[PDB]
Amino acid sequence: EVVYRRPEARDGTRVWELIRDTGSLDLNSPYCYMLLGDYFNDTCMIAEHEGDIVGFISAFRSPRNPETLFVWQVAVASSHRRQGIAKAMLTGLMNQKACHGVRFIETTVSPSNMASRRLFLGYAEEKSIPSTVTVGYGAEMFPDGTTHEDEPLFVIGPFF
C-alpha cells in the first residue's frame, strides 16, 4: 500500500509542505526541493500513500568522496510514523543501482531525536555495520534568534 518512488521537480511543493508540516527547523525553500527532484533524484526517495506524500529522504554523494552518501533530510508525516516508512525509504535508497559503490552513510542526528537515531543505527545493526559519532554542527553554529539543537555526525560503514 505505501509506494516508494523518486521525487520529481513537480513534487517540490508537496515535499516542502510535508517538511513544513513536521515543524522542522531545517525547512528549505520550495525551489530547493524542485531542484532535488530534477538533479538529485537518484539519491532521493518519496513515500506515497493513496496519492499523498507521506515520506521523503534526500541525500547526495559527496562531490569530493563519492563513496560517501550524506543523508541530509528524512521526514515522515506524523500520522504515518512508526510504521517502518523511513526504514523502507532508507533501505530502498541503498538497494538501487544509483547507490552502488556507496561505502559510508553519513548524517547528523540531534541527541533528542531518538526516532532518527534508531532509523540509522537500526539500519547499521541490521547489516552488522559499524557506526561512530563525531562532532558535527553544534548548537552555537546556528543563527542567534533561532535555537537549534546540536547536530553530531553519524558515520556508518564501511559497507564493503
Ligand X SMILES: CC(C)(COP(=O)(O)OP(=O)(O)OC[C@H]1O[C@@H](n2cnc3c(N)ncnc32)[C@H](O)[C@@H]1OP(=O)(O)O)[C@@H](O)C(=O)NCCC(=O)NCCS
Q: Which is nearer to a second copy, 38 or 125 (CB)?
A: 38
Cα dihedral sign, 25-49-59-14: negative
5-24 residues near ligand X, rule: CB under 6 A:
22, 24
| Burial letters 125-145, b for 16+ CB under 10 A, else e | eeeebeeeeeebeeeeeeeee
Under the binding rule (CB under 6 A), the answer on residue 112 touching ligand X is no
Residue from 88, 42, 33, 76 nearest 61 by CA: 42
Specify the stretch interacting with a second copy by CB under 8 A; choose among 38-46, 83-91, 112-120, 124-132: 38-46
> Quick check: 69 and 103 in contact, CB under 8 A?
no
- Tell me whether residue 6 is annotated as binding: no
Question: Which CA distances in Å does 128 have to 98, 132, 156, 157?
Answer: 22, 13, 10, 9
State which of residues 34, 89, 94, 109 lies at the interface with a second copy (CB under 8 A): 34
Q: Which three cell numbers stand for residue 37?
A: 527532484
Please choose which of a second copy, ligand X, none residue 79 contacts, taking the beta carbon within 5 to 8 angstroms, the exact cut-off set by kind. none
Under the binding rule (CB under 8 A), the answer on residue 12 touching a second copy is yes
- Tell me whether residue 118 is annotated as binding: yes
Largest CA distance in the chain: 43
Q: Rule CB under 6 A: which residues touch ligand X? A: 22, 24, 73-76, 81-87, 113-116, 118-119, 122
The contact set with a second copy (CB under 8 A) reads 9-10, 12-13, 16-17, 25-32, 34-35, 39-40, 42-43, 60-64, 70, 72, 137, 141-143, 146, 148, 151
